[PDB]
Amino acid sequence: LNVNENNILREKFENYARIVFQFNNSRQANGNFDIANEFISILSSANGTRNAQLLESWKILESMKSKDINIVEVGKQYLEQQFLQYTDNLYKKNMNEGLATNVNKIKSFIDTKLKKADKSWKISNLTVINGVPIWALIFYLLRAGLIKEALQVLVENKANISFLTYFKAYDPYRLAVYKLIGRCDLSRKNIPAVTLSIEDWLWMHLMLIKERYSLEDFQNIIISYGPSRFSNYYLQTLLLSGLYGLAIDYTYTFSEMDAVHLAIGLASLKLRFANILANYTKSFRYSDPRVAVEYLVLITLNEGPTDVELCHEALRELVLETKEFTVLLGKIGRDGARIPGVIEERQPLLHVRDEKEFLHTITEQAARRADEDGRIYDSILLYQLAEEYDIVITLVNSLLSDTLSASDLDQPLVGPDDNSETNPVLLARRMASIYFDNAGISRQIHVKNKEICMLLLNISSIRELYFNKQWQETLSQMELLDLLPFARKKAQDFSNLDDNIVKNIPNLLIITLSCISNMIHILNESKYQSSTKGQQIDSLKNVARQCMIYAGMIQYRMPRETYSTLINI
Ligand SMILES: [Cl-]
């Protein structure tokens, strides 16, 4: 199965996921939720053989919630209720009413199912009174769960006739009633003339159970005959007999998705689950990591210490293999506070040993994995969530330093599409503004790292000035850097510069020298009237001259290629 194979299957996935979503919400708010009711709602509008079969299975589960656990009593209750409802629909069709007594809905039923049209009884040897078959009536009252009424009918006709003595304690139809009430002749479980449907058969057996006829015996018979002999009522049969594992199996044969969700239903009723959910996750795990988390969180539906470990393990393998860190593990907001990911939202349901250490451990681990894989952006994101502030600055300083030295001066550092997640300049600005102005966080950062970062930000500002041809403002910003000789002293210090700064100096010199060439040209124009024209030129030529000697002393510590474009300027 693959939930993304087509749009017909994809929609069903979304509808079911929303249900599971609301279920986790109830579990967590410790509130009221009726999952069976939910699917019943979604399936009642569906159409087909299997869908009609699934809709009824959910009704079976629904009619079973919050009830004393008793497979046989619950199967009887269900089948009896269902027959009653069935006789209702028949009355509301034949007599078009809806307000007749139970007893009358049933005589109306008995009357239209035991006559050949001929006003001739279809089954010979019926004991009759006032034109109505007392044992047939008595049987279908039982069959409807209406023991009070069945007893009344027996009492009334007492005389036209002490099985009645035993009945109070507890023709073919007369044979059935004695057999069911007496629970006699168990060797002959079947009395077919009065069995007109599969529902009737299952109910007959359930009646008979625990001279000795056990549920396990009933189940054996069912399994023995297999799906072959239950037409389109095998799932119901499986659930009614309490063969829950086999019900799921069977549902897998025509619909993996419905099987998963039926299993969620039985589980929520407390009756390979982790594996059922982990497997169903496989196809939408990468395209919908939030839905994956929702289904895996169901694993703790059972509170055993064993399957809580299965849940954490599955969640670990989700984050490691999908690397949807932001969604799963969260992200840091501009106030410095973590904005929870999906796993942190469902943490109550996770039954963790330590609220804070569970996510921290996964995060720290994924972090060491990211910097070993060379995933720089992942690393930065993860070390933020780890609150490893200093490592974050170090990694940003490298990333930003590398972007500056490797980009061309002619090309803008930052486009209109760029964001703090993908652009090193934008990213670094975001980190500075979240961490440097936050005293609690800044103290955790090494003053030198913070220095380098500010420098790299200043340099990125200088770069945008330079690109927009703001020569003079570039120069005065360049001068505040305290890096270039506005000489010999600083070339000697060149060896003590941070490794991140030194790869930026060659471009700094090319910007500096090129702003000077441009200003000088502007100052030489005729239109340029200033009384200090000449002292400005000279002063610019001084800076250029000192950068040149500086440049020459450090010439083999930048590519010849750049030292050459710098000399020829
Ligand atoms: Cl640069």
UniProtKB/Swiss-Prot annotation:
- Mention any one GO cellular component term assigned to this protein in its UniProt record: nuclear pore nuclear basket
The reply to whether NAD figures as a keyword in the UniProt entry is: no
Give the membrane topology, semicolon-separated if more than one: Peripheral membrane protein
Top-rank taxon: Eukaryota
Lipid biosynthesis in keyword set: no
Q: Name one GO biological process term.
A: protein import into nucleus
User: Which keywords annotate this record?
Assistant: Membrane, mRNA transport, Nuclear pore complex, Nucleus, Protein transport, Translocation, Transport
* GO MF annotation list: structural constituent of nuclear pore
List the subcellular locations: Nucleus, Nuclear pore complex; Nucleus membrane
What remark does the entry add?
Present with 15500 molecules/cell in log phase SD medium.
Q: Which family does it belong to?
A: Belongs to the nucleoporin interacting component (NIC) family.
Complex and partners:
Component of the nuclear pore complex (NPC). NPC constitutes the exclusive means of nucleocytoplasmic transport. NPCs allow the passive diffusion of ions and small molecules and the active, nuclear transport receptor-mediated bidirectional transport of macromolecules such as proteins, RNAs, ribonucleoparticles (RNPs), and ribosomal subunits across the nuclear envelope. Due to its 8-fold rotational symmetry, all subunits are present with 8 copies or multiples thereof.
Q: What does this protein do?
A: Functions as a component of the nuclear pore complex (NPC). NPC components, collectively referred to as nucleoporins (NUPs), can play the role of both NPC structural components and of docking or interaction partners for transiently associated nuclear transport factors. NIC96, which is localized to the core of the NPC and the distal ring of the nuclear basket, is required for de novo assembly of NPCs. It is involved in nuclear GSP1 import.
Query: Protein name, please?
Result: Nucleoporin NIC96
From the UniProt record, report the name of the gene that encodes this protein: NIC96
Part of the whole protein covered: 200 to 835 of 839
